């Protein structure tokens, strides 16, 4: 739960970036205020495989399958239900982050 590219400068990770409002955008990426705190929008900011979110939230829906036939600059991707959906963050690894 800590791998946002915004922190590299000093900012913090914007929890639930898959639904965060990006009122800002520079050459660093995207930024938004969540819960009264500045943070970049990193769908893959470093969240465990606890099914916290899904990939492809940039425009398409979630796949639900852990079969990423293709990976892009936004994570992994798969073809499910005859649609281009992203792989669920839970479909990454099992030992994601120690037991709480």
From TrEMBL:
It comes from Piromyces equi. Residues 3-42, 53-88 form the CBM10 domain. The lineage of its organism: Eukaryota, Fungi, Fungi incertae sedis, Chytridiomycota, Chytridiomycota incertae sedis. This is Cellulase. It comes from the Eukaryota. Disulfide bonds join 4-13, 14-39, 54-62, 63-85, 66-91. Belongs to the glycosyl hydrolase 45 (cellulase K) family. The gene is cel45A.
